């Protein structure tokens, strides 16, 4: 079984064969493992032919000696590890090694920007951090060894309906400054580098704003002094008259 | 574990501050400084005590079907009736005392004559 | 049988176990020796200069030099939050201003009523 | 933007009523002199 | 048969299978993808009936949901003695300026 | 299913260990296996009957018994570091009826040559930027977990006491701080992304948590650090806003409008006390 | 459709099943019998209603259904979700009644200082 | 709209004003 990670692009129909050559088995089937996890069974055919369980689809050739699976729409929740196995009537199934997959998705419209996130006063770090990028970008390893860099990842936020890319790198040292960070990595024209002056939209912190029962209890206290307070004036403004009118 | 087995559940949606008893049983039996409070079958396993910025205090206890568990002293002060002074605020006390003293004055001379 | 007791003044937490009469204490939070060698441990009592609220809040407990602290008598939870130049408003502390303003303010109409009085 | 019971309405109602009542004495006021 | 009500980070959703239909109650939003509502923020009580449609073999079938929330957030916790106190005071108010009128009225 | 116990495991060299394997769906034959890069599932040793067990490809340094139908054990007699790996065990009912393994969920070993190389994480948390949050209206938290020795953490996100699993994306693999070496430490990384609008409520509790697993209470240390052994780290923050008017502020308007209110209505209440008990003063003096 | 019934006072919640008028009706939450059979002091049956004394809202909230005795709970497509926050002496008030009790107030006392000035000029 | 500070010292000027312009007008009748 050839291994290598290969990478396809999302919606496409991926191909993975297995060579057997040469001897005469009879009980086919393969197994998918996710990262940090155990094996689990997905299809299991002993015949010629196809046997179908949903979008998961299998060829069997006897007198070609090879196997096949067939992925089609393709999800990016298929990144795994397919192992093939085969055996006789007896005992001690045999194992191949095993081939990654990588699918990755549409980015339908990318932004991509490098932005400086804040301290955290508890350790002597600073990062940065590149995100959404195309999809086709490759983000390369450090040169220098005080420098930190990994690899890219997918995330999936379902509240917003909304997938991204991300990379992040991080430093001890002085002079290290998000913009000279990634520069070892060909990188997109145009991305956008920010700027230190601020830019705080006073319009959108109103739209969370929030009430207890203790404020609506004090706020309705303040407005039941200011009703003693004009009775009570009106008594001493109407007092004060008739003490020096007399 | 050494009977130590009453535990504080926090920092949910609302303030509410719960305590979960640690033992495997029906019917537990809550205390509060010796004297019960309380009566917890199943289907709830949580004590309520409120919201926080009431700030509860106290020392309580769980039984099960063994012994009685060793107490737990909960102390919250969430100051919720908190001024800070600045000169603003300063500011705008004095100026306030001022000018009601002045009207008040004003009213006492054409009292007096 | 006596709880512990704690002590706010700014920010600076001090808390005091008076449960053991004459021995060497430990102090220990969140199952983490705390204490010795800002933090500081008196005889008896145990210091927290600039305390924070989310850094320290969670479970405290002293025992005996030489035991075990699963072995104490009861542990202490607290959750407090401080501030600096900050007065917090009681149902007294507000009747003292009142009371203290209402015996500032009543002497001087009585400097004008009589000012007043022997002018016309 | 979930205010509840602290609208500003309330606020702005008590001081409108004090308002009313001023223009209404400063009118009669005018009237005599 | 259940139409699953999940809860992101502070809104709530309505998933199902198939298209959504509105019978009454709050309308909401369609996000990019067909087959999910957002009915907006929990602490401003949305509330309705939506009705939905089956495949996964509970094919040829149909259910409904109805949504009620109470978060009681213009809301005021008063006891029943304090209520006496306040129209207690309020009574003695309007006495004391009914008594400062008639002292005025002749001089 | 087939259940296998621990998860976790650092021994020195020189130590047995006995880790087991159970199941209940009355299959009657057993396998175990172990796992490396670049070379596949290997058979260590397999049990065809209660009471007969046989030798597979790699079995020198290993030890078997079958006793009963649900379980079958395995022990390391003296471990070196070649032992290494992640071990798995399989079933299956009886003998190419219906050839379907069922794999267990896996143990992690690593072996040392020393205790002093164990090492806990340390967690920080880093706020999201403003740039973003005015660019792209939503904002992204970063926890950093750095210098752990072994590889055994579990890292997760919890908001308002309660955990999240939609808007996560954890590394698969921790990296080496100096991958030349050979007792390097670790390091792994991860991320939330939340709109902008959930950031700001200054209401909100966000926190990461890592669980660790080293060492237990039947080992000695003799060292000046404390013992490093199975516990919990974290970090936490509550959102804020930069700008404007938050619910923070408005109850601070609000306290010190009841003060002075409170007390324009004491003196009020003296000038009334004073006028009423000269004008009473007055119409006894009358007669 | 014909909709349920919410009613809550102090921290007591009433449910009502609409549909069914002259059977006998079973009540079950989270696919668990609740109600009926004695236990629970706090929780109480009816011809149609369900009495809930002690609400809690992080326990006891999300599904619930009615169907009639004889029948299987699978068979039912029409449910609730409710979420309710309860306190005891904690009232729902709203912006316009505390403007008409303060304008009501304001009336009321300045057409009884009218009244006593103009008795008090006609003595 | 959203600060009540503003209500606050608008509900501070008007009261004054209100007191000293009426105690000016009955005593001219
Ligand atoms: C008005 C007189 C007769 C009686 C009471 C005094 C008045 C002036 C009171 C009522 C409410 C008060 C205000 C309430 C809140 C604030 C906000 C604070 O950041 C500065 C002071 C300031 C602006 C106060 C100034 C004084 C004030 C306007």
């Known amino acids: 079984q050839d291994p290598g990670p290969l990478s396809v692009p999302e919606g496409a129909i991926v191909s993975l064969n297995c060579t057997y050559s040469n001897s005469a088995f009879q009980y086919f089937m393969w197994y998918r493992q996710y990262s940090r996890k155990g094996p689990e069974l997905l299809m299991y055919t002993y015949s010629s032919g196809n046997k179908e369980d949903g979008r998961f689809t299998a060829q069997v050739d006897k007198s070609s000696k090879y196997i096949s699976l067939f992925i089609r729409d393709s999800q990016p929740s298929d990144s795994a590890t397919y192992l093939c196995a085969m055996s006789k009537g007896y005992s001690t199934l045999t194992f191949g090694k095993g081939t990654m997959l990588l699918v990755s998705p549409d980015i339908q419209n990318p932004d991509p920007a490098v932005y400086q996130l804040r301290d955290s006063k508890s350790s002597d770090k600073s990062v940065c951090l590149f995100t959404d990028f195309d999809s086709q970008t490759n983000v390369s390893q450090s040169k220098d060894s005080d420098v930190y860099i990994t690899d890219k990842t997918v995330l999936d936020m379902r509240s917003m309906d909304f997938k991204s890319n991300s990379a992040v790198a991080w430093s001890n040292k002085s002079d290290f400054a998000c913009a000279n960070a990634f520069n070892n990595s060909i990188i997109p024209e145009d991305t956008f580098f920010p700027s230190p002056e601020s830019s705080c939209d006073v319009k959108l912190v109103e739209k969370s704003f929030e009430t207890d029962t203790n404020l609506n209890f004090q706020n309705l206290s303040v407005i039941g002094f200011r009703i003693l307070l004009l009775k009570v004036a009106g008594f001493n403004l109407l007092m004060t008259l008739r003490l020096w009118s007399s | 574990k050494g009977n130590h087995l009453v535990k504080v559940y926090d920092y949910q949606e609302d303030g509410s501050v719960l305590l979960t008893c640690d033992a495997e049983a029906k019917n537990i039996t809550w205390f509060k400084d010796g004297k019960m409070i309380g009566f917890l079958t199943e289907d709830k396993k949580k004590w309520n005590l409120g919201s926080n910025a009431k700030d509860p205090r106290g020392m309580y206890q769980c039984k099960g079907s063994q012994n009685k568990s060793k107490p737990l002293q909960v102390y919250y002060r969430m100051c919720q009736n908190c001024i800070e002074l600045n000169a603003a605020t300063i500011s705008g006390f004095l100026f306030a005392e001022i000018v009601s003293i002045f009207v008040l004055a004003v009213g006492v001379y054409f009292i007096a004559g | 049988q006596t709880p512990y007791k704690v002590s706010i003044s700014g920010t600076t937490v001090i808390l005091t176990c008076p449960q053991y009469p004459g021995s060497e204490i430990l102090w220990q939070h969140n199952d983490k020796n705390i204490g010795g060698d800002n933090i500081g441990s008196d005889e008896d009592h145990l210091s927290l200069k600039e305390f924070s609220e989310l850094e320290q809040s969670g479970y405290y407990v002293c025992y005996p030099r030489g035991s075990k602290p699963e072995d104490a008598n009861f542990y202490l939870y607290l959750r407090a939050r401080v501030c600096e130049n900050c007065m917090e408003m009681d149902v007294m502390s507000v009747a003292t201003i009142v009371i203290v303003d209402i015996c500032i303010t009543g002497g001087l109409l009585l400097l004008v009523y009589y000012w007043s009085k022997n002018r016309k | 933007q979930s205010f509840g019971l602290l609208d500003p309405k309330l606020c702005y109602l008590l001081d409108g009523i004090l308002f009313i009542y001023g223009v209404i004495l400063t009118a009669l006021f005018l009237r005599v002199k | 048969f259940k139409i699953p009500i999940e809860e992101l980070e502070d809104r709530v959703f309505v998933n199902c299978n198939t298209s959504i239909t509105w019978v009454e109650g709050t309308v909401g939003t369609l996000l990019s993808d067909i087959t999910r509502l957002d009915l907006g923020k929990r602490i401003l009580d949305p509330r309705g009936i939506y009705r939905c449609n089956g495949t996964d073999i509970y094919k040829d079938k149909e259910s409904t949901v109805q949504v009620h929330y109470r978060m009681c957030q213009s809301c005021v916790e008063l006891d029943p003695a304090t209520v006496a106190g306040i129209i207690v005071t309020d009574v003695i108010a309007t006495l004391l300026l009914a008594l400062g009128v008639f002292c005025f009225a002749g001089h | 299913g087939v259940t296998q116990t621990p998860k976790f495991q650092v021994l020195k060299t020189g130590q047995s260990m006995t880790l087991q394997c159970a199941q209940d769906?009355?299959?009657?034959?057993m396998s175990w296996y172990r796992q490396d890069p670049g070379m596949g599932l290997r058979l260590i040793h397999y049990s065809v009957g209660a009471g007969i067990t046989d030798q597979g490809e790699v079995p020198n340094g290993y030890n078997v018994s079958r006793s009963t139908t649900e379980d079958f054990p395995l022990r390391l007699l003296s471990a070196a570091p070649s032992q290494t790996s992640v071990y798995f065990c399989?079933?299956?009912?009886?003998?190419?009826?219906?050839?379907?393994?069922?794999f267990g969920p896996g143990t992690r070993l690593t072996v040392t040559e020393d205790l002093k190389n164990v090492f806990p994480p340390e967690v920080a948390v880093f706020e999201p930027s403003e740039a973003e949050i005015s660019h792209t209206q939503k904002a992204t938290l970063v926890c950093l977990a750095t210098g752990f020795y072994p590889d055994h953490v579990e890292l997760s996100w919890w908001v308002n006491g309660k955990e999240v699993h939609s808007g996560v994306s954890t590394d698969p693999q921790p990296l080496k701080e100096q991958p030349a070496l050979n007792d390097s430490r670790y390091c792994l990384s991860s991320r939330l992304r939340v709109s902008a609008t959930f950031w700001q409520n200054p209401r909100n509790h966000f926190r990461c948590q890592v669980q660790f697993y080293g060492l237990s209470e039947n080992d000695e240390w003799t060292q000046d650090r404390a013992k490093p052994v199975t516990q919990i780290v974290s970090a936490e923050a509550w959102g804020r806003a930069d700008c404007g008017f938050t619910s923070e502020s408005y109850q601070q308007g609000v306290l010190s409008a009841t003060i002075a209110y409170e007390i324009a209505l004491g003196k009020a209440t003296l000038y009334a006390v004073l006028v009423s008990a000269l004008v009473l003063m007055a119409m006894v003096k009358r007669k | 459709q014909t909709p349920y019934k919410v009613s809550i006072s102090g921290t007591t919640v009433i449910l009502t099943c609409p549909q069914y008028p002259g059977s006998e009706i079973l009540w079950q939450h989270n696919d668990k019998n609740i109600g009926g059979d004695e236990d629970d002091k706090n929780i109480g049956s009816d011809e149609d209603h369900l009495s809930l004394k002690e609400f809690s809202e992080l326990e006891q909230s999300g599904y619930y259904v009615c169907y009639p005795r004889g029948s299987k709970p699978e068979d039912a497509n029409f449910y609730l979700y409710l979420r309710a926050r309860v306190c005891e002496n904690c009232m729902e008030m709203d912006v316009m009644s505390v403007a008409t009790i303060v304008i009501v107030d304001i009336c009321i006392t300045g057409g009884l200082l009218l009244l006593v000035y103009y008795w008090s000029k006609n003595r | 709209l959203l600060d009540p500070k503003l209500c606050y010292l608008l509900d501070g000027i008007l009261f004054i004003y209100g007191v000293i312009l009426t105690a000016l007008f009955l005593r001219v009748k």
């Open positions: 399989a079933s299956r009912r009886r003998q190419g009826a219906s050839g379907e393994q069922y």
């Open positions: 769906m009355n299959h009657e034959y």
